[PDB]
Paper text:
Hexameric [name] rings act as the replicative DNA helicase, encircling the leading strand DNA template at the replication fork. Mcm2-7 complexes are loaded to encircle double-stranded DNA (dsDNA) via a ‘gate’ between Mcm2 and Mcm5 to yield a double hexamer that does not unwind DNA. These factors stimulate the Mcm2-7 ATPase and helicase and with Mcm2-7 form the CMG complex (Cdc45-Mcm2-7-GINS), the active replicative helicase. Following activation, two Mcm2-7 helicases encircle single-stranded DNA (ssDNA) and translocate independently, 3ʹ→5ʹ, on the leading strand DNA template with the ATPase domain leading.
We tested the DNA unwinding activity of PfMCMAAA to compare with that of the Sso-[name] chimera to explore interdomain communication. The inactivity of PfMCMAAA could result from attributes identified in the PfMCMAAA double-octamer crystal structure (see ‘Materials and methods’). Specifically, the non-hexameric ring architecture or the alternative topology for the helix-2-insert region, both of which we consider artifacts of the N-terminal truncation, could fully explain the lack of unwinding by this domain.
Residue numbers in the entry:
A (entry chain A), B (entry chain B), C (entry chain O), D (entry chain P): 263 to 361, 729 to 746, 753 to 904, 919 to 965
Write the structure that this text describes.
C-alpha cells in the first residue's frame, strides 16, 4: 500500500504514457509502436463478462512478424523480464526460462510450449511450432479454452492468457511485393486472432543502422549505461498488475464517436467487424495504462493511431 | 399460477407481437425478421397428430447463412440464454454450454453435438459439422427420428426438437451473383428441411455501420444500459413454455384464403408443396405467440410477410 | 373423452379393485396376489421429482420366480396383451412379439432384449439372460439410467420403464429347505430392486390340480368361454394410461400411521429402509388403481397385505 | 449488497450455527453431525498460501461410508441442490446432473466423473469408480493437482475443489467386528485424505425407525410440508460464497490451547500429525461459518467435538 502511493503519483505524471513504453525495452532502440503496442497488450482490454452479453475477453494478443535480425527474439525476452506472469518459450529445444519464480503460479494449468491456464505467454518463433504446439494456441486464441480428452477422461482447460508472439516468413525474408500475409507460415484463421500485427522488414539505410549499432555498443559495454528503464521494472510491474485490477475503463461518448467514425473509415477498402472489437480493446487498455477509467477522446484517438500504423506497415 | 396471471396480461397488450421480438436479442441491433423468425420458431407450429392424418410435426427449423461477422454466432447464443430447453453447440472443440441446468432435462436422449431427444438445439456453424454429427441432424430434420443400432442392439431415438442453426458459405463470403444455395456446404435435401432460411450478406454502407457500431459500444460498456429486454426473460420464457402448452391455433377460413391465395402466387416461378406446409406452421405459431387459438387473417398475413422476405433476401 | 366418462363410472363401482385383477389374466386360474401384484405394478407409484428431494422413481418392478410349469411364461404373455406399452421378451432366440404396434413407440430408446427407454418390459426367463442383456437391466433397475459409450461417443439412455419379470431357480425347482434366494441365478443386488418377488413352488395336491386342469380345458376349447375379462381390455388399458396421468395420490395421515406401524414391525427380524420405500409405492399405486388421489388407510392396509404375503411365500 | 445486509443479520442470530445445519438437508432426518460436518466442509478452512510456508490448502474433504439404505446417495444429492459450485456424480452410467447452470463455471478444468478444476464435487459411490476415475481423485486429494500428458503435450490441471463423497463396504454391509477401514474398497492412502469420515452402520431399533419413516412420509406427501430449510437455500448459498470470501479466521490463543491439548490427547492410542492439520481446518471453517474471523475457544471446542464423534463411530 506504500507502493499504491507511488503508483498513483506516477500516473499523475504528465508523460506517463511515454515513460511506460521507454521502459518496455530500453535496450532495443526504436520501435516506438511495437513497444507502445506490447505496452497496451500488457495492460489488456476491459475483459468483464455479463450474463446478457455472455463471455467477454479483454486480453490483447500481439504478433511480431519480420525478416531475421530485427530484434524480435530479443524483444520478447525483455518482456519476459518485465511482465508479471510472463512465460518466454521459443520453438526450439525443451523447457523454457522466463519466470522469476515464486513457488510456481497463482492459478491453474501448464503444458508443452509452457502456458499458465492467466499470464502473458511470450511465444518466439511461432512459425516453427510443431503442428501440435500450434494447434493448442490456435484453440487458445480462438476458443479461449483448451481441451485434452486423451483417455476416458475429458479435460477442458480454461485459457485466459495474453499472447505476445513473434514469427518469420515462410521464406525467411519477404521484401518482395507479395502480401506479408501469404508469406507467414500460420493459418490465417489464427492470425486473425491478433489485435495487432507488427510487420518488420529491414531495408539497409545508413542513418538508422548507424544509430542501431551505436546503440548496441553503448548498452553492451560494462555492466551499466544510461540505457536502463525510465521507470524501475519492479515498480512498473506492480503498476501493471495494479491497473489490471482496480481499473475498468468505460467508454466516453467522447471517444465512442472517434472509434466508430474510424471503424467505418477502416471499412472502406481484409477487414471485418472484429477489427472494431480489438480496436475497442486497445483504447480501453490505453486508458487503464494510465488508470482513467474513462476511455477519453485521446485514448480512443491513440488506439486508432497505433492501429492505422500496424496497417500502413502492411503495404511494406 | 400467479404467473399465468401476468402472461394473459402481456398478451392483452396491443404490441405484444413486437415486444416479443424486441426481447429475443436486445443486444444485436436490427434483424427484425431474423428475430421475428426465431420468435416463431420458439413458439412452433400446431404439432398435433391424428390417426387418419398420421404423424404431425409442428416444430419450426430455422437456418441462418451469411458472410462472416454478421452476428450469427452471437444471436444463437442469446437465444440459448432465453429459450427454455436450449442447447447451443458450435462445430468446434468438445462439450457445450447453453443450459441453465436443473438436474438435467425432463425427458429422453442426448449425444455428440448435444441434442435432447424435446428442446431447441441452437447449432452454430452447421457447415463445419463432422459428416457424422451432420448425418444425425439430417435424419433428425428429415425423419423426425434418429437411430443407432451399433452392435446387436437397435436404438431408435425419437427426435422431437427445434433446430435454429447458422452456417457460412463454402467460400466464407458469397457476394458474387451465383445463388446462395450453391454456396452453402449443406446437402440441399437438408436445407429443404428448414421453414425459413435467412441469408445474410453484408455490404458496407455508412449509415447502418454507424448504427451498428454505436449500438455495440452502447450495450458494451459497464454492466448495464437502456438496452435490455422489453420483456423480462424469466417471464418471456414462461410465456413461451405456456403457449406451447395451452394454445393450439385452428385455421380461420379467414386466414386460409390468405395463405392459399399466396401459396399459388408463390408457385408461379425451387418451390414445392412443402413450402405450403411450413407456411402453415409459421402462421399457426404467430398466433400461439399471442395465444389465439385462431390463425386470423392477420396471423396468416404476417406469416407470408416474413416468408416473402426470407425469399427476397435470396436474390441478394 | 367419451371414454373418460366410462372410466369414472368404473371407478365408481364398489368392487373395482377386485374387478381389475380378475381382468389381468382370466385364463390362468388363481394367483390372486401375483395378479393384484402385477396390477399395482401396471399402475405404478407416484413418481414425481422435486428439486430438494431430487429424482423420484415410482415404477414398480415385479419378479416371478418358481418351479417350472407354474404359468410364469404364460402370465407375462397375457400382460403384454393388456398393458399399454408392453414388451414381452423371453431369454431365447431373437426379436420379440408383445406390442400391438402403431408406428412404433411415443418416445426414446430401444435395444437387444427390447426395452423402450417408458413402457413395461415383461422379461420372461430373466435367469437365462446373456450376462450382457442382464447387465443393462441391472443398471436400468439400479441406476434408472442406461449407458453405451462404445466408441468416441458417449450415450446415456434414460431408463424409465417398469419390469415385470419371471425366473427359474439355478436348479430348476427348489422345494428343498434352503432359502429361495440362494437358488435364483440373479445377483442379489439386482433382486433387491424388485418391489415384490412372488415365489412359486408347486406341491402336487389333488384339489387345486383338479381345479387348475378343469380350468385349462374350459378356457381351452373352441374360440370362446365364460372365461374372459371382467372388464374389456381396451377399456381397462385406457383406464390404466388414464390413472397414470391424472392421479397422483398423496399420503393420508390416516394411512401413514399404518405403513410406518408396519415397517417397524417388518424391521423386527433381509430388510432395510428400502422395503419402506417400495411399500410406499404399492399403496400409492393401489390408490391410483381406483383413482383417489389419497392413499387412505385401506390402500396402505392392502399394500402391506400383499407385502406380508410375498413374504410368507419366502418361508416356502 | 442488499443481500450482504441480510447475511450479517443472520450471523447476528444466536443459533445460526444450528440453523445452518438444519438447512443442509431438512429432508433426511437426523445425522446432526454428518450435517454439521458437511456444513463445515462447505465453508472450508482458511486456505491462504505464504512464500515461507509454501502452499496452504483449506478445502475440507468428507467421506461417508456405510451399510446400504442409510441416505448417503440421498444426502449428497441435497447438497448439490444447495452448494454453489456443486457437482454430483455417482459411479454409474454417463454424464451427471447437479448444477443449476449459468453459462458453465467461472474458471478452469472439467472431466470424466465431472470435476471443475473450484467447486465441491459430490461423489457418490466412490467405491465403484473405475480405477481410472479413482486415480484422478486420489491425485487430486493427495497432490492437489491433476495431470494428463497423453501425447507429446503435458497438461497439469490445478486441483482446487472440495470432495464430499460416499461409499459402501467391499462387502455391502459391515456390522461385523472387523475394522470399518478394512471393509472399504479404497486405498488407505486415499482415505487418509479426508478430514472427517462418517461411518454409518444401521441397527434396526424401533424408536429411530418409527421416526425416520414417519418423517419420510411427512416430507413425501403433496408438494409441501413444514419440512423445508430453516434458512432459504438461495440466501444460505450466498451466505456461503460470501464467508468463503471476506472471512479468514485467525487462531485465538484461546482456541489454540484447546486444539493442542486435544491433539496430544488424540495421540495417546491410526493417528499422525495430519490429524492436527485437519482439526485446524474444521475449527477455522466453523468460525467462517458464522464469520468471526477469530477461531474462539468455542469454535476450536466444537471442532474437536465433531472429530471425537467421527472417531467414536469407528468403534461401531
Ligand atoms: N532495433 C534494434 N535495437 C537494438 N538491437 C537490435 C535491433 N535490431 C537488431 N538488434 C540486434 O540483433 C540481435 C537480436 O537479433 P534477434 O532479435 O534475435 O533476431 P530475431 O528477432 O529474428 O530472432 C541483438 O543482439 C541486437 O543487438
Ligand atoms: N447487427 C449487429 N448488431 C450487433 N452487433 C453486431 C452486429 N453484427 C455484428 N456484430 C458484432 O459482431 C460480433 C459477433 O460476430 P459473430 O456473430 O460471432 O460473427 P459470426 O456470426 O460469423 O460467427 C459481436 O461481438 C457484435 O458486436
Ligand atoms: N395356475 C394355472 N392356471 C392356468 N394354467 C396353468 C396354471 N399353471 C400352469 N398352467 C398351464 O401351464 C402352461 C404354461 O406353463 P408355463 O407358464 O409356460 O411354465 P413356465 O412359467 O415355467 O414357463 C399353460 O399352457 C397352462 O395351461
Ligand atoms: N435417516 C434418513 N432420513 C430420511 N430418509 C432416509 C433416512 N435413511 C434412509 N432414508 C430413505 O432411504 C432412501 C435413500 O436411500 P439411499 O440414500 O439412496 O441409500 P444409499 O445411501 O446406500 O444409496 C430415501 O428415499 C429415504 O427416504
Ligand atoms: Mg528469432
Ligand atoms: Mg460464427
Ligand atoms: Mg418359462
Ligand atoms: Mg447409494
Amino acid at each position: 500500500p506504500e507502493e499504491e502511493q507511488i503508483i498513483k503519483e506516477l500516473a499523475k505524471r504528465k508523460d506517463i504514457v511515454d515513460a511506460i513504453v521507454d521502459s518496455i525495452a530500453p535496450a532495443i532502440y526504436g520501435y516506438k509502436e511495437v513497444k507502445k503496442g506490447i505496452a497496451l497488450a500488457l495492460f489488456g482490454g476491459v475483459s468483464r463478462k455479463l450474463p446478457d452479453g455472455t463471455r467477454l475477453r479483454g486480453d490483447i494478443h500481439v504478433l511480431l512478424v519480420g525478416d531475421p535480425g530485427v530484434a524480435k527474439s530479443q524483444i520478447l525476452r525483455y518482456v519476459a523480464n518485465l511482465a508479471p506472469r510472463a512465460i518466454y518459450t521459443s520453438x526450439x529445444x525443451x523447457x523454457x526460462x522466463x519466470x522469476x519464480x515464486x513457488x510456481x503460479x497463482x492459478x491453474x494449468x501448464x503444458x508443452x510450449x509452457x502456458x499458465x491456464x492467466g499470464g502473458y505467454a511470450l511465444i518466439d518463433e511461432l512459425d516453427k511450432m510443431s503442428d501440435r504446439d500450434r494447434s493448442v494456441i490456435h484453440e487458445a486464441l480462438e476458443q479461449q479454452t483448451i481441451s485434452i480428452s486423451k483417455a476416458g477422461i475429458t479435460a477442458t482447460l480454461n485459457a485466459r492468457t495474453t499472447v505476445i508472439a513473434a514469427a518469420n516468413p515462410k521464406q525467411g525474408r519477404f521484401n518482395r511485393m507479395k502480401n506479408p500475409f501469404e508469406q507467414i507460415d500460420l493459418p490465417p484463421t489464427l492470425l486473425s486472432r491478433f489485435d495487432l500485427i507488427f510487420v518488420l522488414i529491414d531495408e539497409p539505410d545508413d542513418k538508422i543502422d548507424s544509430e542501431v549499432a551505436r546503440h548496441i555498443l553503448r548498452v553492451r559495454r560494462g555492466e551499466s549505461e544510461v540505457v536502463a528503464p525510465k521507470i524501475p521494472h519492479e515498480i512498473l510491474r506492480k503498476y501493471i498488475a495494479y491497473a489490471r485490477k482496480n481499473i475498468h475503463p468505460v467508454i466516453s461518448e467522447e471517444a465512442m464517436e472517434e472509434i466508430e467514425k474510424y471503424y467505418v473509415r477502416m471499412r472502406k477498402s481484409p477487414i471485418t467487424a472484429r477489427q472494431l472489437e480489438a480496436l475497442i480493446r486497445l483504447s480501453e487498455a490505453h486508458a487503464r495504462m494510465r488508470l482513467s477509467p474513462i476511455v477519453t477522446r485521446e485514448d480512443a484517438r491513440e488506439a486508432i493511431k497505433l492501429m492505422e500504423y500496424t496497417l500502413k506497415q502492411i503495404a511494406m
